């Protein structure tokens, strides 16, 4: 037992120089080579399992069921059950034996090749073939691609074909005019360090029509992935990158060959888009000639995944940014489908799975809108649309009459002196105001006020019976919605500017339409769904329902009055119930103040759809109610 019990330390500690990769560490304790000692050398050893374990993509080596025994005066007999994996799968229920040996004052491992594969003996081979996995497709709630693996135009240039002086420059001009493209890029990419003369150097995946081709150009057609949307969808869709060896190392399964999703959906589901590679693990003896299968099944290519997106209102709702900073959500609010989540501005996403230079990447990332940004997805105070809200729970706890009007003078005001300078500030001087008024014309100082009658527990009672610090269930990466940082305000002015939506309110564009929701189901919340096959899940009694059939009324009058915040919609001619909002923050790096303006709008006779857009930091005399007719017409017709 004295020696025994060091026998299983040695081959425990084999397995985990094995398992870390460390074959010199793994080699250094074997026995001499000689007959019934180790069959190699300490280097022969080493380069025994990083040649075959390397080939295989060996990871996470890992034995069970060890015993350990005795044959001989210093010879220890040891097996036990190992698994593996490999870049074909995991290799389960593998019998391991060999012998020991206790020499000196340590015991080493007479190490034999059934000790890298069991059945291995002598100088066989280990062989392995695979076949890649073609990538699934992404695709909308009618089967439009979003992301796909289609035939693409690459232009290039040979150099050798190109000239030799003048005639070289003429056509690399000629090349650089007729596909848009810069003549310092073309003599830059010719000019590279991997560059041959006979070589094609490849310059730009080009769309569409192909004009003529100068001398040097041709045009290949190569697969690869392809977006297209394009931009307007890039935040959410993702791009797909190289694989490198670190992918690899954290997973074998992956294909060295292949693609990985980096960001967006195409890296949720990467492991469902990119399917399982086939081929064969397999022994062969001295000469090629197969011995054991190890591991084989044939490739299976990556299943689709179909989401709940309108490929027409995605692009419309992301053209309507114009390039401004913003997003817009789109749902049909009695199911929860999301039909649109464009976020602006936002980056080529064909360019970055193609070829885009350090230059180009660095301008996106440099961008002080940052168009990598999923906006969707990032947690904003809501902005004085968050009235409703307020008001849904003033009118179910009783604390606000409809018909009460409450006498403001000014477009400032505070609860007391101990407020100091600040005040709640609106927009319209209206001496006479009530619920339907206050909707009307965006009346923060009504909000404020009727938030600190009804006083913070009750507020606060009302605001828990939504989805804040909720994770919903969705295939994006985003933070719950927060109603401010600790569970208490201890504060007057934070409780007074959350009733109207910006104090410490986190809440992200989807988290809002979710919220919102209630509006369209008669103070049911529908969980918001991107996976169309998914099932509908709903919260039921979040307000009351005599509250929506109060509040919905006076959000028709934000459109149809002469002096609603969203009248310019009621050109539209169509059934419409909105709320305007904005929201101010302090910036600090101009620390002028930056604005933030937020439209609300659905359809309250059939709640077909519903949406919610917002224009971050916007320009002067802009707003998200100036860019939404088109997105409206559009859900309006086509989701009743």
Do not use: C
């Not at 929506?548 to 009058?557: S, Y």
């Not at 998200?624 to 086509?638: D, G």
């Amino acid at each position: 037992t004295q020696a025994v019990e060091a026998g299983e330390k040695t081959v425990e500690q084999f397995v985990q120089a094995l398992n870390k990769g460390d074959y010199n560490k793994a080699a250094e304790m074997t026995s001499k080579k000689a007959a019934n000692k180790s069959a190699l050398s300490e280097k022969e050893i080493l380069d025994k399992y990083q040649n075959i374990y390397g080939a295989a993509d060996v990871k996470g080596l890992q034995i069970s069921n060890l015993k350990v025994d005795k044959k001989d005066d210093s010879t220890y007999s040891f097996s036990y059950k190992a698994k593996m994996n490999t870049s074909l799968g995991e290799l389960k229920d593998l019998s391991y034996k060999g012998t020991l040996d206790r020499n000196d004052g340590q015991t080493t491992i007479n190490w034999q090749p059934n000790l890298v594969f069991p059945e291995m003996e002598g100088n066989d081979k280990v062989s392995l073939t695979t076949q890649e996995a073609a990538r699934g497709n992404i695709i909308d709630r009618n089967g439009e691609p979003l992301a796909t693996t289609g035939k693409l135009k690459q232009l290039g240039v040979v150099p050798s074909k190109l000239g030799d002086g003048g005639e070289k420059t003429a056509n690399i001009k000629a090349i650089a005019s007729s596909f848009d493209l810069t003549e310092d890029a073309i003599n830059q990419a010719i000019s590279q360090s991997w560059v041959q003369p006979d070589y094609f150097v490849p310059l730009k995946i080009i769309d569409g029509a192909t004009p003529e081709l100068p001398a040097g150009a041709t045009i290949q057609e190569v697969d690869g992935r392809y977006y297209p949307l394009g931009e307007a969808a890039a935040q959410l869709i993702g791009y797909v990158g190289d694989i490198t060896a670190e992918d690899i190392d954290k997973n074998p399964e992956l294909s060295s060959n292949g693609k990985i999703g980096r960001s967006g959906l195409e890296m949720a589901f990467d492991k469902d888009l990119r399917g399982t590679t086939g081929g064969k693990l397999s022994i062969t003896d001295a000469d090629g000639v197969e011995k054991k299968v190890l591991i084989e099944h044939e490739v299976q290519n990556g299943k689709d995944i179909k989401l709940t997106i309108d490929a027409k209102a995605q692009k419309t709702a992301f053209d309507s940014l114009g390039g401004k900073a913003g997003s817009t959500v789109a749902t049909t609010p009695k199911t929860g489908d999301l039909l649109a989540l464009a976020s602006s501005p936002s980056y080529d996403p064909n360019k970055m799975t193609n070829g885009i230079s350090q230059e180009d990447y660095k301008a996106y990332e440099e961008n002080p809108e940052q168009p990598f940004i999923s906006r969707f997805a990032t947690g904003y105070a809501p902005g004085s649309t968050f009235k409703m809200i307020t008001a849904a729970i003033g009118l179910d706890n009783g604390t606000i009459d409809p018909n009460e009007v409450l006498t403001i003078n000014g477009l400032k005001w505070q609860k007391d002196s101990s407020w100091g300078s600040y005040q709640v500030t609106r927009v319209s001087d209206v001496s006479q105001v009530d619920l339907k008024t206050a909707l009307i014309y965006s009346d923060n100082i009504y909000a404020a006020q009727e938030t600190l009658k009804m006083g913070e527990k009750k507020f606060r009672t009302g605001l828990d019976k939504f989805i804040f610090g909720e994770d919903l269930d969705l295939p994006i990466s985003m933070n719950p919605a927060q109603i401010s940082n600790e569970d208490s305000f201890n504060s007057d002015i934070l409780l007074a500017d959350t009733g109207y939506g910006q104090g410490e309110l986190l809440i992200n564009p989807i988290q809002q339409a979710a919220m919102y929701s209630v509006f369209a189901n008669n103070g049911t919340l529908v969980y918001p769904k991107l996976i169309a096959d998914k099932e509908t899940k709903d919260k039921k009694n979040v307000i009351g329902e005599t509250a929506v059939q109060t509040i919905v009324p006076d959000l028709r009058e934000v459109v149809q009055d002469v002096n609603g915040t969203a009248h310019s919609l009621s050109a539209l001619g169509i059934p419409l119930a909105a709320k305007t909002g904005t929201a101010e923050i302090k910036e600090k790096q101009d620390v002028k103040g930056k604005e933030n303006s937020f439209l609300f709008a659905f359809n309250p006779d059939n709640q077909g759809y519903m949406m919610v857009s917002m224009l971050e930091n916007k320009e002067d005399d802009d707003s998200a109610t100036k860019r939404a007719s088109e997105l409206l017409q559009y859900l309006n017709q086509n989701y009743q």
